[PDB]
């Protein structure tokens, strides 16, 4: 029920698919149980995106909760808008005895509006104990832009704070700065982990993923070996990186020979696992390629050694 | 069984045929345009040597 | 003679 708010809600309501209309509209709380029956969710897309936004016209929707709608949309569509991983680092001392979600919301919004005075920061403390910050940016010269927001999934007391790599503007060093000063840390470092599957980045940065008689195969002693070495490097249930696992090679050919390798698969760490047994790869499959989760890194910048 | 022993006789009268051919080739110790020509004049002459053999 | 089958079939095991 406002400029860049009502039509913003319209643009985020045609984004959400028809199946999970109830799921996202129930969680953002503006449509109570009585309001759900008024609109027939099963009829049409333009019908619902017109009646629902009217149901907020009577509900006088504001950007503070319109952005929360976008948050809840992305919580089920986090597998888009490839995510950078920021890693905080406190120095020597005790941990953050005060991460009050109210205090963190204050210490983040205050620092962000200290310089980026026109931003619509909207938090959503999820049930997995990970505040799902969404930031619509805009300098003092412009209104906060909700067209391209920068969602930041900060796990509540974790040194790691995922970030939607939207545009990587001059706010990115302020995104990390506000993040590391709201949560009582000192150094913000981009881990350089950049994947589209946040549910896999969560696994990686937390190490949370692993916790006939006639056909005489003459190279059976080699197939057994290659299967063995592909089970002590890729143990069980690898997580889908699905990311351009770059290897910006700077090595001499055996002065350097610059390369910018980009492994690109819908499911990378499983694609590598089925390489050596398929004959494409050697059995010891180059730890540069096996230690993507073990190093918690895929955007490599290797050199010679 | 006799049919199976017959399939064996036959198979061995040809496996020893191959064995004897190879050992005779090992017993022995150029114009590629005609190297296939003095390759062809047996594949016609072994052919008349064994089509009559099969025919007998 | 002939380990083959005339032995192997007869010594089927």
């Amino acid at each position: 029920m406002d400029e860049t708010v009502a039509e913003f809600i319209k643009r985020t309501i045609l984004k959400i698919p028809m199946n999970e209309l109830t799921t996202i509209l129930k969680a953002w709380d503006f449509l109570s149980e009585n309001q759900l029956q008024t609109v027939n969710f099963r009829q049409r897309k333009e019908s619902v995106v017109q009646h629902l936004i009217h149901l907020c016209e009577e509900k006088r929707a504001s950007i503070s909760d319109a952005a929360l709608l976008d948050i809840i949309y992305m919580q089920f569509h986090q597998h888009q808008k490839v995510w950078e991983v920021f890693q905080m680092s406190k120095g020597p001392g005790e941990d953050v005895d005060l991460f009050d979600m109210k205090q963190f919301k204050n210490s983040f919004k205050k620092i962000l509006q200290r310089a980026l005075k026109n931003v619509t920061v909207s938090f959503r403390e999820t049930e997995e104990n990970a505040v799902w910050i969404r930031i619509a940016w805009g300098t003092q010269y412009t209104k906060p832009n909700q067209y391209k927001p920068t969602y930041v999934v900060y796990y509540s007391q974790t040194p790691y704070a995922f970030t939607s790599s939207s545009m990587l503007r001059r706010n990115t060093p302020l995104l990390g700065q506000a993040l590391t000063i709201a949560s009582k840390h000192h150094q913000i470092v981009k881990m350089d982990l950049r994947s589209r599957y946040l549910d896999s980045l969560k696994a990686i940065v937390f190490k949370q993923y692993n916790q006939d008689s006639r056909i005489i195969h003459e190279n059976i002693v080699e197939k057994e070996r290659v299967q063995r070495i592909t089970q002590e490097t890729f143990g069980d249930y690898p997580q889908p990186q699905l990311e351009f696992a770059q290897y910006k090679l700077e090595t001499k050919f055996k002065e350097p020979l610059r390369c910018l390798i980009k492994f690109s698969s819908p499911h990378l760490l499983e694609a590598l696992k089925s390489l050596a047994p398929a004959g494409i790869a050697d059995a010891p499959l180059s730890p540069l390629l096996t230690c993507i989760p073990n190093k918690r890194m895929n955007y490599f910048k290797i050199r010679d050694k | 069984r006799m049919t199976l022993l017959l399939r064996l006789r036959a198979q061995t009268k040809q496996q020893l045929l191959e064995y004897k051919s190879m050992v005779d080739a090992s017993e022995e110790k150029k114009q590629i345009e005609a190297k296939i020509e003095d390759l062809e004049n047996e594949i016609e002459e072994v052919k008349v040597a064994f089509e009559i053999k099969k025919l007998a | 003679k002939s380990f083959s089958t005339l032995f192997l079939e007869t010594v089927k095991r």
């Binding site: 056909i215 005489i216 195969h217 003459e218 398929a278 004959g279 | 199976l4 198979q11 040809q14 190879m22 | -």
Partner: protein, 168 residues
């Protein structure tokens, strides 16, 4: 180094040894080559490269079909590397050059002339097919198994030596 007559034959055993870098496709070809209940024992052998780690009791191998996956230049660099460990008396009749992936002609990292030149410069039959599809496998399997009975001597009129005189 493999030799044709290094071991003694069985009775109806026709031991063919597939050669190809990709091994799932070799396994599929071996499955199709044993799907038909032929009149010969068919102890099919698989491999990846002709050094063929030296294990005694390996039967008299009656055929080596070099499955050259035309989609991958590796399958030729691993065939041409493996072509140097075949006895010169083995290349006469008991060698075929399967070229899987031919016909798709859009994935071919290898021009089919190159496999033609390789299979002509080694004087051995070259049988195109597309091993990925059973419709072209369950008919190439019955071609490799009738070449098998020729090289293994099961047809009592034609040797492996007579074979290449037919497929020139």
């Amino acid at each position: 180094v493999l030799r044709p007559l290094d071991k003694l034959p069985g009775l109806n055993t026709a031991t063919i040894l597939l050669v190809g870098t990709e091994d799932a496709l070799l396994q599929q070809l071996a499955d199709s080559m044993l799907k038909e209940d032929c009149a010969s024992e068919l102890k099919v052998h698989l491999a990846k490269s002709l050094p063929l780690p030296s294990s005694v009791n390996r039967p008299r191998i009656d055929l080596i079909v070099f499955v050259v996956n035309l989609h991958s230049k590796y399958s030729l660099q691993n065939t041409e590397e493996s072509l140097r460990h075949v006895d010169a008396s083995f290349f006469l009749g008991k060698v075929c050059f399967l070229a899987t992936g031919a016909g798709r002609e859009s994935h071919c990292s290898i021009h089919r002339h190159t496999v033609v030149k390789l299979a002509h410069t080694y004087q051995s039959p070259l049988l195109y097919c597309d091993l990925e599809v059973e419709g072209f496998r369950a008919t190439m399997a019955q071609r490799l198994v009738r070449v098998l009975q020729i090289c293994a001597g099961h047809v009592p009129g034609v040797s492996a030596l007579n074979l290449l005189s037919l497929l020139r």
